Amino acid sequence: MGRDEAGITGTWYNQLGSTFIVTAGADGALTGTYESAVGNAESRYVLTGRYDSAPATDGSGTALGWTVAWKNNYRNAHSATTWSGQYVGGAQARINTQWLLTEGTTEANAWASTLVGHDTFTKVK
């Protein structure tokens, strides 16, 4: 069992109203689906990622990341978002992330290919 396997597994919501459904494996795997409340997206998209299954015991957070490519049976936004952040456990559990969203571009437009932002996920709302 990963130390935070049970803490991470389940349904999470961010500040935009997006929904992240994840299963944490004992081996450090994250698998699930993402539904974005914003952007060129509809319905659910596959996600995959990794987490630290043996975090420090000094009250540090648990490092994790995941990827969504924005193609499903409904739409293709020719883009991928990666979230990098940490899981913080306790009464008000949260995942605090920063993300990079790259779109496919021509070489001429590649300077303008990547957005950056930050999402906070909680188990309520």
DSSP 26-91: TTSEEEEEEE-SSSS--S-EEEEEEE-SS--SSS--EEEEEEEEEE-SS-EEEEEEEEEEEEE-ST
Options 9, 19, 33, 86; binder of a second copy; rule CB under 8 A: 86
**66 annotated ligand binder:** no
**70 annotated ligand binder:** no
Contacts of 75 (CB under 8 A, 6+ apart): 40, 41, 42
Should residue 111 be labelled a site residue for a second copy when binding is judged by CB under 8 A?
yes
Cβ contact 89:65 at 8 Å: no
- Degrees, nearest 5: CA angle 23-36-14: 70
Which residues from 31-70 bind a second copy, rule CB under 8 A? 38-39, 46-56, 58-70
**13 annotated ligand binder:** no
**Shortest Cβ distance from residue 12 to a second copy (Å)?**
16
Q: Which residues are annotated as a binding site?
A: 34, 45, 83, 99, 111
Site residues (vs a second copy, CB under 8 A):
16, 27-29, 38-39, 46-56, 58-71, 76, 78-86, 88, 96-108, 110-118
Q: Which residues are annotated as a binding site for biotin?
A: 34, 45, 83, 99, 111
